[PDB]
Coordinates of C-alpha atoms in Angstrom, one line a residue:
Chain A
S1 CA 28.1 100.8 19.5
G2 CA 30.7 100.1 16.9
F3 CA 30.2 99.7 13.2
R4 CA 31.2 96.7 11.0
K5 CA 30.6 95.6 7.4
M6 CA 27.9 93.1 8.4
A7 CA 26.6 90.2 6.2
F8 CA 23.2 88.5 6.5
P9 CA 23.0 85.2 8.3
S10 CA 23.6 82.5 5.7
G11 CA 21.7 79.5 7.2
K12 CA 18.8 79.6 4.8
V13 CA 21.0 79.7 1.7
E14 CA 23.4 77.0 2.9
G15 CA 20.8 74.3 2.6
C16 CA 20.3 75.3 -1.1
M17 CA 23.8 74.9 -2.5
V18 CA 24.5 71.9 -4.6
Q19 CA 27.5 70.7 -6.8
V20 CA 26.9 70.5 -10.5
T21 CA 29.1 68.5 -12.8
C22 CA 28.9 68.3 -16.6
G23 CA 31.8 66.6 -18.4
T24 CA 35.0 67.8 -16.7
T25 CA 33.5 71.1 -15.4
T26 CA 32.2 71.4 -11.8
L27 CA 30.6 74.5 -10.3
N28 CA 27.9 75.5 -7.8
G29 CA 24.2 75.4 -8.3
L30 CA 21.1 76.7 -6.4
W31 CA 18.6 74.0 -5.6
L32 CA 15.1 75.5 -5.0
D33 CA 12.2 73.1 -5.0
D34 CA 12.9 70.7 -7.9
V35 CA 14.9 73.1 -10.1
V36 CA 18.6 73.6 -10.0
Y37 CA 20.0 76.9 -11.2
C38 CA 23.6 77.2 -12.4
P39 CA 25.7 79.1 -15.0
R40 CA 25.2 77.8 -18.5
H41 CA 28.9 77.7 -19.1
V42 CA 29.1 74.5 -17.0
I43 CA 28.6 72.9 -20.4
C44 CA 31.8 74.4 -21.9
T45 CA 35.3 73.2 -21.9
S46 CA 38.1 75.7 -21.4
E47 CA 38.4 75.6 -25.2
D48 CA 34.7 76.3 -25.8
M49 CA 34.8 79.4 -23.6
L50 CA 36.7 81.4 -26.3
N51 CA 33.8 81.4 -28.6
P52 CA 30.9 79.3 -27.3
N53 CA 27.8 78.6 -29.4
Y54 CA 25.6 77.7 -26.4
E55 CA 22.7 76.4 -28.4
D56 CA 24.7 74.0 -30.3
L57 CA 26.7 72.9 -27.2
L58 CA 23.5 72.4 -25.3
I59 CA 22.1 70.2 -28.1
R60 CA 24.8 67.5 -27.7
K61 CA 23.9 67.3 -23.9
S62 CA 21.2 65.0 -22.5
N63 CA 19.7 64.8 -19.0
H64 CA 22.2 62.1 -17.9
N65 CA 25.2 64.3 -18.8
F66 CA 24.6 66.4 -15.6
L67 CA 25.7 65.2 -12.2
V68 CA 24.0 67.2 -9.5
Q69 CA 25.2 66.4 -6.0
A70 CA 23.5 67.7 -2.8
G71 CA 25.9 66.5 -0.2
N72 CA 26.3 62.7 -0.2
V73 CA 23.1 62.2 -2.3
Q74 CA 22.9 62.4 -6.1
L75 CA 20.0 64.1 -7.8
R76 CA 18.2 63.0 -10.9
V77 CA 17.8 65.3 -13.9
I78 CA 14.5 65.1 -15.7
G79 CA 14.6 68.2 -18.0
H80 CA 16.9 71.0 -19.0
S81 CA 16.2 74.4 -20.5
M82 CA 18.3 77.5 -21.0
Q83 CA 16.9 80.7 -19.7
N84 CA 19.2 83.5 -20.9
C85 CA 22.6 82.7 -19.3
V86 CA 21.4 80.3 -16.7
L87 CA 20.7 76.5 -17.1
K88 CA 17.5 75.2 -15.3
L89 CA 18.1 71.6 -14.4
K90 CA 14.6 70.3 -13.5
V91 CA 15.2 67.4 -11.0
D92 CA 13.0 64.9 -9.2
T93 CA 13.6 65.5 -5.5
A94 CA 12.3 68.8 -4.4
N95 CA 14.5 70.5 -1.8
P96 CA 12.9 70.0 1.6
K97 CA 15.0 72.9 3.0
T98 CA 13.6 75.3 0.4
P99 CA 13.0 78.7 2.1
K100 CA 10.4 81.3 1.2
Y101 CA 12.3 82.9 -1.6
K102 CA 12.1 85.6 -4.3
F103 CA 14.1 86.5 -7.4
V104 CA 14.9 90.2 -7.6
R105 CA 17.1 92.3 -9.9
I106 CA 18.9 94.9 -7.8
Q107 CA 19.9 98.4 -8.9
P108 CA 23.5 99.8 -8.7
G109 CA 24.4 101.1 -5.3
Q110 CA 22.4 98.5 -3.5
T111 CA 24.2 95.9 -1.2
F112 CA 23.8 92.2 -0.7
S113 CA 25.6 89.3 0.9
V114 CA 27.6 86.7 -1.1
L115 CA 27.8 83.1 0.1
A116 CA 31.1 82.0 -1.5
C117 CA 31.1 78.3 -2.3
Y118 CA 33.4 75.6 -3.8
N119 CA 32.2 72.2 -5.0
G120 CA 28.8 72.9 -3.7
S121 CA 30.1 73.6 -0.1
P122 CA 29.9 76.9 1.7
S123 CA 33.3 78.5 2.3
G124 CA 32.5 82.0 3.7
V125 CA 30.1 85.0 3.6
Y126 CA 30.8 88.7 3.0
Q127 CA 28.8 91.9 2.1
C128 CA 29.4 93.9 -1.0
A129 CA 27.8 96.5 -3.3
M130 CA 26.8 96.5 -6.9
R131 CA 29.0 99.2 -8.4
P132 CA 27.6 101.9 -10.7
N133 CA 29.4 100.1 -13.6
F134 CA 27.6 96.8 -12.7
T135 CA 30.7 95.0 -11.4
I136 CA 31.4 93.7 -8.0
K137 CA 34.7 93.6 -6.1
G138 CA 34.4 90.1 -4.6
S139 CA 36.6 87.3 -3.5
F140 CA 36.1 84.4 -6.0
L141 CA 38.5 81.6 -7.0
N142 CA 38.1 79.1 -9.8
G143 CA 35.0 77.0 -9.3
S144 CA 33.3 79.6 -7.2
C145 CA 31.0 80.1 -10.2
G146 CA 27.4 79.5 -9.2
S147 CA 27.8 81.2 -5.8
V148 CA 24.8 83.5 -5.1
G149 CA 24.2 86.9 -3.6
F150 CA 21.1 87.5 -1.5
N151 CA 19.3 89.8 0.9
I152 CA 16.9 88.8 3.7
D153 CA 13.5 90.5 4.3
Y154 CA 12.5 89.0 7.7
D155 CA 11.6 85.5 6.5
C156 CA 11.9 85.9 2.7
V157 CA 15.3 85.3 1.0
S158 CA 15.7 87.6 -2.0
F159 CA 18.2 86.1 -4.5
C160 CA 19.7 88.9 -6.6
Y161 CA 23.1 87.7 -8.0
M162 CA 24.9 84.7 -9.4
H163 CA 28.6 84.7 -10.1
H164 CA 29.7 84.0 -13.7
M165 CA 32.9 85.7 -14.7
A166 CA 36.2 87.1 -13.3
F167 CA 38.0 89.6 -15.3
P168 CA 41.7 90.2 -15.8
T169 CA 41.1 93.5 -14.0
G170 CA 40.2 91.7 -10.7
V171 CA 36.5 92.5 -11.0
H172 CA 33.6 90.1 -11.1
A173 CA 30.5 90.0 -13.2
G174 CA 27.3 87.9 -13.0
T175 CA 23.6 87.7 -13.7
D176 CA 20.3 87.9 -11.9
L177 CA 18.6 84.6 -11.3
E178 CA 16.6 84.8 -14.6
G179 CA 20.0 84.8 -16.4
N180 CA 20.4 88.4 -17.5
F181 CA 23.8 89.8 -16.9
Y182 CA 24.2 92.9 -14.9
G183 CA 26.1 95.3 -17.1
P184 CA 27.3 94.9 -20.7
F185 CA 29.0 91.6 -20.2
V186 CA 28.7 88.3 -22.0
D187 CA 29.8 84.8 -20.8
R188 CA 32.7 84.3 -23.1
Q189 CA 36.4 84.4 -22.5
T190 CA 37.3 87.7 -24.2
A191 CA 38.4 91.2 -23.3
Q192 CA 35.5 93.2 -22.0
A193 CA 35.6 96.7 -20.6
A194 CA 33.6 97.9 -17.6
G195 CA 32.6 101.5 -17.4
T196 CA 34.4 104.2 -15.3
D197 CA 33.5 103.5 -11.7
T198 CA 32.0 106.2 -9.6
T199 CA 31.5 106.6 -5.8
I200 CA 28.0 106.0 -4.5
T201 CA 27.4 109.4 -2.9
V202 CA 24.1 108.6 -1.1
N203 CA 25.9 105.6 0.6
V204 CA 28.8 107.8 1.7
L205 CA 26.4 110.2 3.4
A206 CA 24.7 107.3 5.2
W207 CA 28.1 106.3 6.5
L208 CA 28.8 109.8 7.8
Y209 CA 25.5 109.6 9.7
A210 CA 26.6 106.3 11.1
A211 CA 29.9 108.0 12.2
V212 CA 28.0 110.7 14.0
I213 CA 25.8 108.1 15.6
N214 CA 29.0 106.5 16.9
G215 CA 30.7 109.6 18.2
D216 CA 32.9 110.7 15.3
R217 CA 31.9 114.3 14.7
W218 CA 35.1 116.2 13.7
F219 CA 34.1 116.3 10.0
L220 CA 31.0 118.3 11.1
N221 CA 31.4 121.9 10.0
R222 CA 29.4 125.2 10.1
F223 CA 28.9 125.9 6.4
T224 CA 26.0 124.7 4.4
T225 CA 25.6 124.5 0.6
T226 CA 23.1 123.7 -2.1
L227 CA 22.4 120.5 -3.9
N228 CA 23.4 122.2 -7.2
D229 CA 26.8 123.4 -5.9
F230 CA 27.5 120.2 -4.1
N231 CA 26.8 118.2 -7.3
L232 CA 29.3 120.4 -9.1
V233 CA 32.0 119.5 -6.6
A234 CA 31.0 115.9 -6.6
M235 CA 31.0 115.5 -10.4
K236 CA 34.6 116.7 -10.3
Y237 CA 35.7 113.8 -8.0
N238 CA 33.7 111.1 -9.8
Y239 CA 30.8 110.9 -7.3
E240 CA 27.3 110.0 -8.2
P241 CA 25.1 113.2 -8.4
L242 CA 22.6 113.6 -5.6
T243 CA 18.9 113.8 -6.3
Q244 CA 15.9 114.7 -4.1
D245 CA 14.9 111.0 -3.8
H246 CA 18.3 110.6 -2.2
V247 CA 17.7 113.4 0.3
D248 CA 14.3 111.8 1.2
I249 CA 15.8 108.3 1.7
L250 CA 18.1 109.9 4.3
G251 CA 15.2 111.4 6.1
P252 CA 15.0 109.0 9.0
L253 CA 18.8 109.2 9.5
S254 CA 18.3 113.0 9.6
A255 CA 15.4 112.9 12.1
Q256 CA 17.2 110.5 14.5
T257 CA 20.3 112.7 14.6
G258 CA 19.0 116.3 14.1
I259 CA 21.4 117.1 11.2
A260 CA 20.2 118.3 7.8
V261 CA 21.2 116.3 4.7
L262 CA 22.4 119.5 3.1
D263 CA 24.5 120.2 6.2
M264 CA 26.0 116.7 5.9
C265 CA 26.8 117.4 2.2
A266 CA 28.7 120.6 3.1
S267 CA 30.9 118.5 5.4
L268 CA 31.4 116.0 2.5
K269 CA 32.2 118.8 0.0
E270 CA 34.9 120.0 2.3
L271 CA 36.2 116.4 2.8
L272 CA 36.6 116.0 -1.0
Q273 CA 38.5 119.3 -1.5
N274 CA 40.6 119.5 1.7
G275 CA 41.0 115.8 2.3
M276 CA 41.2 113.6 5.4
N277 CA 44.6 115.0 6.6
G278 CA 45.5 111.7 8.1
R279 CA 42.4 111.5 10.3
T280 CA 40.0 108.6 10.2
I281 CA 36.2 108.1 10.3
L282 CA 34.9 104.9 12.0
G283 CA 38.4 103.5 11.7
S284 CA 38.9 104.1 8.0
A285 CA 41.3 106.4 6.1
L286 CA 39.0 106.6 3.1
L287 CA 35.4 107.4 2.4
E288 CA 33.3 104.2 2.4
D289 CA 30.4 103.7 0.0
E290 CA 29.3 100.1 0.6
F291 CA 26.7 100.9 3.2
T292 CA 23.2 101.9 2.1
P293 CA 21.0 104.1 4.3
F294 CA 18.9 101.0 5.1
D295 CA 22.1 99.1 6.0
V296 CA 22.9 101.8 8.6
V297 CA 19.4 101.9 10.0
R298 CA 19.5 98.1 10.3
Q299 CA 22.8 98.1 12.2
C300 CA 21.9 101.1 14.4
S301 CA 18.4 99.7 15.5
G302 CA 18.9 95.9 15.7
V303 CA 16.7 94.5 13.0
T304 CA 16.3 90.7 13.2
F305 CA 15.0 88.0 11.0
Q306 CA 13.6 84.4 11.1
Chain B
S1 CA 40.9 86.8 -7.2
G2 CA 40.0 89.7 -4.9
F3 CA 40.2 89.8 -1.1
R4 CA 37.4 90.4 1.4
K5 CA 37.0 90.3 5.2
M6 CA 35.1 87.0 5.1
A7 CA 33.0 85.4 7.9
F8 CA 32.3 81.7 8.4
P9 CA 28.8 80.5 7.2
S10 CA 26.5 80.9 10.2
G11 CA 23.9 78.1 9.6
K12 CA 25.1 75.8 12.3
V13 CA 25.1 78.5 14.9
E14 CA 21.7 80.0 14.0
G15 CA 19.8 76.9 15.1
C16 CA 21.4 77.3 18.5
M17 CA 20.3 80.8 19.5
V18 CA 17.5 81.2 22.0
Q19 CA 16.0 84.2 23.9
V20 CA 16.5 84.2 27.7
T21 CA 14.3 86.3 30.0
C22 CA 14.6 86.8 33.8
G23 CA 12.6 89.4 35.4
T24 CA 12.7 92.4 33.0
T25 CA 16.0 91.5 31.4
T26 CA 16.1 89.7 28.0
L27 CA 19.3 88.7 26.2
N28 CA 20.6 85.8 24.0
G29 CA 21.5 82.3 25.0
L30 CA 23.3 79.4 23.4
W31 CA 21.2 76.2 23.4
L32 CA 23.4 73.1 23.0
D33 CA 21.9 69.7 23.9
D34 CA 19.8 70.4 27.0
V35 CA 21.9 73.2 28.5
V36 CA 21.4 76.9 27.7
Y37 CA 24.4 79.2 28.2
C38 CA 24.0 82.9 28.8
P39 CA 25.6 85.9 30.6
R40 CA 24.9 85.7 34.3
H41 CA 24.1 89.4 34.4
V42 CA 20.7 88.4 33.0
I43 CA 19.7 88.1 36.7
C44 CA 20.5 91.8 37.4
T45 CA 18.4 94.9 37.1
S46 CA 20.1 98.1 35.8
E47 CA 20.5 99.0 39.4
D48 CA 22.1 95.8 40.4
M49 CA 24.8 96.2 37.7
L50 CA 26.5 98.9 39.7
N51 CA 27.6 96.5 42.4
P52 CA 26.2 93.1 41.9
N53 CA 26.6 90.3 44.4
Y54 CA 25.9 87.5 42.0
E55 CA 25.7 84.7 44.6
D56 CA 23.1 86.5 46.6
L57 CA 21.1 87.6 43.5
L58 CA 21.2 84.0 42.2
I59 CA 19.8 82.7 45.5
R60 CA 16.6 84.6 45.2
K61 CA 16.0 83.0 41.7
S62 CA 14.3 79.7 41.1
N63 CA 14.0 77.6 37.9
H64 CA 10.6 79.1 37.0
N65 CA 12.1 82.7 37.0
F66 CA 13.8 82.0 33.7
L67 CA 11.9 82.2 30.4
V68 CA 13.9 80.5 27.7
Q69 CA 12.3 80.8 24.2
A70 CA 13.6 79.0 21.1
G71 CA 11.4 80.5 18.5
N72 CA 7.7 80.0 19.1
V73 CA 8.3 77.2 21.7
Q74 CA 9.1 77.8 25.4
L75 CA 11.7 75.7 27.1
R76 CA 11.5 74.3 30.6
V77 CA 14.3 74.9 33.2
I78 CA 15.1 72.0 35.5
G79 CA 18.4 73.3 37.1
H80 CA 20.7 76.3 37.2
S81 CA 24.3 76.6 38.2
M82 CA 26.8 79.5 37.8
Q83 CA 30.1 78.6 36.1
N84 CA 32.3 81.7 36.6
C85 CA 30.5 84.4 34.7
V86 CA 28.1 82.2 32.7
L87 CA 24.7 80.8 33.8
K88 CA 24.0 77.2 32.8
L89 CA 20.2 76.7 32.5
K90 CA 19.7 73.0 32.3
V91 CA 16.5 72.4 30.3
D92 CA 14.4 69.4 29.4
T93 CA 14.3 69.4 25.6
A94 CA 17.7 68.8 24.0
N95 CA 18.4 70.8 20.9
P96 CA 17.8 68.5 17.9
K97 CA 19.9 70.9 15.7
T98 CA 22.9 70.6 18.1
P99 CA 26.0 70.5 15.9
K100 CA 29.3 68.8 16.6
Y101 CA 30.8 71.5 18.8
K102 CA 33.8 72.4 21.0
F103 CA 34.6 75.1 23.5
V104 CA 37.9 76.7 23.0
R105 CA 39.7 79.7 24.5
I106 CA 41.5 81.6 21.8
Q107 CA 44.7 83.6 22.0
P108 CA 45.1 87.3 21.1
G109 CA 45.6 87.9 17.5
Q110 CA 43.4 85.0 16.4
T111 CA 40.2 85.8 14.4
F112 CA 36.6 84.5 14.7
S113 CA 33.1 85.2 13.3
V114 CA 30.4 86.9 15.5
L115 CA 26.8 86.1 15.0
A116 CA 25.1 89.3 16.3
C117 CA 21.7 88.5 17.7
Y118 CA 18.8 90.4 19.3
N119 CA 16.0 88.7 21.3
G120 CA 17.3 85.4 20.3
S121 CA 17.1 86.1 16.5
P122 CA 20.1 86.3 14.2
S123 CA 20.7 89.8 12.9
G124 CA 24.1 89.6 11.0
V125 CA 27.5 88.1 10.9
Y126 CA 31.0 89.7 10.7
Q127 CA 34.7 88.7 11.2
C128 CA 36.9 90.2 13.9
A129 CA 40.1 89.7 15.8
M130 CA 40.9 89.4 19.5
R131 CA 43.1 92.4 20.1
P132 CA 46.4 92.1 22.1
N133 CA 44.6 93.9 25.0
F134 CA 41.8 91.3 25.0
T135 CA 39.0 93.6 23.7
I136 CA 37.2 93.3 20.4
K137 CA 36.0 96.1 18.2
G138 CA 32.5 94.8 17.4
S139 CA 29.1 96.0 16.5
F140 CA 26.8 95.4 19.5
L141 CA 23.6 97.2 20.6
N142 CA 21.7 96.8 23.9
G143 CA 20.5 93.2 24.2
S144 CA 23.1 91.8 21.9
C145 CA 24.5 90.3 25.1
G146 CA 24.8 86.6 24.7
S147 CA 25.8 86.7 21.1
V148 CA 28.6 84.2 20.3
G149 CA 31.8 84.1 18.3
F150 CA 33.0 80.9 16.6
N151 CA 35.3 79.2 14.1
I152 CA 34.5 76.2 11.9
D153 CA 36.9 73.3 11.5
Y154 CA 35.3 71.4 8.6
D155 CA 32.3 70.0 10.5
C156 CA 33.1 71.0 14.1
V157 CA 31.9 74.4 15.4
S158 CA 34.5 75.8 17.9
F159 CA 32.8 78.3 20.2
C160 CA 35.3 80.8 21.6
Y161 CA 33.5 84.0 22.7
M162 CA 30.4 85.3 24.4
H163 CA 29.6 89.0 24.5
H164 CA 29.1 90.5 27.9
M165 CA 30.0 94.2 28.2
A166 CA 30.3 97.4 26.1
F167 CA 32.6 100.0 27.4
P168 CA 32.3 103.8 27.2
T169 CA 35.3 103.7 24.9
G170 CA 33.4 101.9 22.2
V171 CA 35.2 98.5 22.8
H172 CA 33.6 95.2 23.8
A173 CA 34.5 92.5 26.3
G174 CA 33.4 89.0 26.9
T175 CA 34.1 85.5 28.1
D176 CA 35.0 82.1 26.8
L177 CA 32.1 79.6 27.1
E178 CA 33.4 78.4 30.5
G179 CA 32.7 81.9 31.8
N180 CA 36.2 83.3 32.2
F181 CA 36.6 86.8 30.8
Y182 CA 39.2 87.6 28.2
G183 CA 41.3 90.3 29.8
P184 CA 41.2 92.0 33.2
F185 CA 37.5 92.8 33.0
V186 CA 34.6 92.1 35.4
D187 CA 30.9 92.1 34.7
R188 CA 30.0 95.2 36.6
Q189 CA 29.0 98.7 35.5
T190 CA 32.2 100.5 36.5
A191 CA 35.1 102.3 34.8
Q192 CA 37.6 99.7 33.6
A193 CA 40.8 100.3 31.6
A194 CA 42.0 98.1 28.7
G195 CA 45.7 98.0 28.0
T196 CA 47.4 99.9 25.3
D197 CA 46.5 98.3 22.0
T198 CA 49.2 97.0 19.7
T199 CA 49.2 96.0 16.0
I200 CA 49.3 92.3 15.3
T201 CA 52.5 92.2 13.2
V202 CA 52.3 88.5 12.0
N203 CA 48.7 89.2 10.7
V204 CA 49.9 92.3 8.8
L205 CA 52.6 90.2 7.1
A206 CA 50.0 87.7 6.1
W207 CA 48.0 90.5 4.5
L208 CA 51.1 91.7 2.5
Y209 CA 51.4 88.2 1.2
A210 CA 47.7 88.3 0.3
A211 CA 48.4 91.5 -1.5
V212 CA 51.2 90.0 -3.5
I213 CA 49.0 87.0 -4.4
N214 CA 46.5 89.5 -5.8
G215 CA 48.9 91.6 -7.9
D216 CA 49.8 94.5 -5.5
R217 CA 53.6 94.5 -5.4
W218 CA 54.7 98.2 -5.2
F219 CA 55.6 97.9 -1.5
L220 CA 58.1 95.2 -2.5
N221 CA 61.7 96.5 -2.2
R222 CA 65.2 95.3 -2.6
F223 CA 66.6 95.7 1.0
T224 CA 66.5 93.0 3.5
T225 CA 66.9 93.3 7.3
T226 CA 67.2 91.2 10.4
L227 CA 64.6 90.1 12.9
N228 CA 66.3 92.1 15.6
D229 CA 66.5 95.3 13.7
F230 CA 62.9 95.0 12.5
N231 CA 61.7 94.4 16.0
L232 CA 63.4 97.6 17.0
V233 CA 61.5 99.6 14.4
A234 CA 58.3 97.8 15.1
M235 CA 58.4 98.4 18.9
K236 CA 58.7 102.1 18.1
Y237 CA 55.3 102.0 16.2
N238 CA 53.5 99.8 18.8
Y239 CA 53.7 96.6 16.7
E240 CA 53.8 93.1 18.3
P241 CA 57.5 91.9 18.1
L242 CA 58.1 89.0 15.7
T243 CA 59.3 85.7 16.9
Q244 CA 60.6 82.6 15.1
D245 CA 57.3 80.8 15.6
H246 CA 55.8 83.6 13.5
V247 CA 58.4 83.2 10.7
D248 CA 57.5 79.5 10.6
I249 CA 53.7 80.0 10.5
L250 CA 54.3 82.2 7.4
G251 CA 56.3 79.3 5.8
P252 CA 53.6 78.1 3.4
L253 CA 52.8 81.7 2.4
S254 CA 56.5 82.0 1.7
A255 CA 56.8 78.8 -0.4
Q256 CA 53.7 79.5 -2.6
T257 CA 55.0 83.0 -3.4
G258 CA 58.8 82.6 -3.4
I259 CA 59.4 85.6 -1.1
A260 CA 61.3 85.4 2.2
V261 CA 59.6 86.4 5.4
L262 CA 62.6 88.7 6.3
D263 CA 62.3 90.3 2.8
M264 CA 58.6 91.0 3.5
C265 CA 59.6 92.5 6.9
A266 CA 62.0 94.9 5.2
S267 CA 59.2 96.2 3.0
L268 CA 57.1 96.6 6.2
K269 CA 59.8 98.4 8.0
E270 CA 60.0 100.9 5.2
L271 CA 56.2 101.2 5.2
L272 CA 56.2 102.2 8.9
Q273 CA 58.9 104.8 8.5
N274 CA 58.2 106.3 5.0
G275 CA 54.4 105.7 5.1
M276 CA 51.9 104.9 2.5
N277 CA 52.2 108.3 0.6
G278 CA 48.5 108.1 -0.4
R279 CA 48.8 104.7 -2.1
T280 CA 46.7 101.7 -1.1
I281 CA 47.1 97.9 -0.7
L282 CA 44.2 95.7 -1.5
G283 CA 42.0 98.8 -1.5
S284 CA 43.0 100.0 2.0
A285 CA 44.8 103.2 3.0
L286 CA 46.0 101.6 6.2
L287 CA 47.8 98.4 7.2
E288 CA 45.3 95.7 8.2
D289 CA 45.9 93.3 11.0
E290 CA 42.6 91.3 11.2
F291 CA 43.7 88.5 8.8
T292 CA 45.7 85.6 10.3
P293 CA 48.0 83.5 8.1
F294 CA 45.5 80.8 8.1
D295 CA 42.7 83.2 7.1
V296 CA 44.8 84.1 4.0
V297 CA 45.5 80.5 3.1
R298 CA 41.8 79.7 3.5
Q299 CA 40.7 82.5 1.2
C300 CA 43.5 81.9 -1.4
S301 CA 42.9 78.1 -1.8
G302 CA 39.1 77.7 -1.3
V303 CA 38.7 75.7 1.9
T304 CA 35.2 74.4 2.4
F305 CA 33.2 73.0 5.3
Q306 CA 30.1 70.8 6.0

């Protein structure tokens, strides 16, 4: 009973966070086996960031220009390469606390947990979603660069995000762990536009099912509707159009509650047009789109990990 | 930049969670050194819970009736006592992963992180507040009993909460780690009323300061007001009255932003009377009271831990 924006337990990621220093810049790095991963803009001064030529900047750097610190013990850099927008600092000591891990590139609308770090030390953990415009709305201060996002599949940690940039708009951008940005962003200090943001409709429907599982049922109505007519209302309010793959994903939520996806949509349709009228659902005065269908099943069944 | 309901990193607590089984019942326990802590109602059947005489039930139990499991390794019970509403199962193996810890009993309005567990395995982590009526609005399924709440002071883990009961109302109740319930609750399966809930006014003001730190300033007005007149408006809307200790706690938030507490109150006063008019603050359509002033300073300065 109850429903909370829940993060994954962070223990397996904590033992992987190191502090990386090059010149005057210090940010966080991810120490798996004997490779440290960190944003390549650790090699830039505040002046370089306006127009960095990363190849030329990297050339004037040698292995002993990088101070990697894992707690009270300094690491030794044996080799450096640049994979897209991440620096791989090959080190000598492999991380004994290296978990079974995996690098994955997530799709918009999926959720993950962020372990926010400063100077290589864990500060806090929260759950967030990759927006349809490939930003995230995080909580990141200066020198939280290098902090990582992750999911947990039983015993395997899936790393999916590394924080790189904060934009004047309040939004945050980063890469996968191979160094490819999510979205059309580049790691330089210049004005960059994100797309129009849209609401993740499949997630909203998973949250309405969570509400029904928890005894909020007032939004339930008698109408039904069609996918095609719903999508016409949704596209008016900047909601992601629903496809059949979406209806199927919500299958188990439908079977455990005996309410048809299309019936849930008809409730939603009404909620977009008529509004909330000052009521709430699961404590909120707005429709929430940061829970995936799998997030809801996990929290309403008690899935555990290593 | 940005603001998120942030939990503490859970690594140090994960290595302390064990599974406790007695008869048919299985819940979570906290394994510090060579003592396991768990709800005493692990010794009850579903029938016993209606009217348990814990002393008599405990008498028919011997050390070998308790199966404590820490992963794939069974623990050995050497002694059991009942401290208030917690069972202390003294075991032989001390926990090697025992952190520097502390038992503390928190006051209403303070916040902590909950590590939700099932069968002794971490499932997720979230942040919550102790309501003024000594409940919490958590996310707990059957057999999440024994899950613990905690804060982190640099390297010391302060344990402050253990989950015991879920009430028909959707609210949750538990004890400190010495076994004293928060609130007027008892561990028996009967109807129990919580008090009227009130909004934690000092927390709300810390969140408005967080909003100003993040560029939301529309609620800022020109009026001021007095503590006494504000408290008269607040007591109308079921808000906790403000005292001078509260104004002082918000001192650093006031100095870093150059806005007087009483000026912030005058904004709040207006917000309670005139309403939100469909605007939002830090993304929310309602006033939030689950951030303490210290929570805001931690997230707006980058405080780190071991």
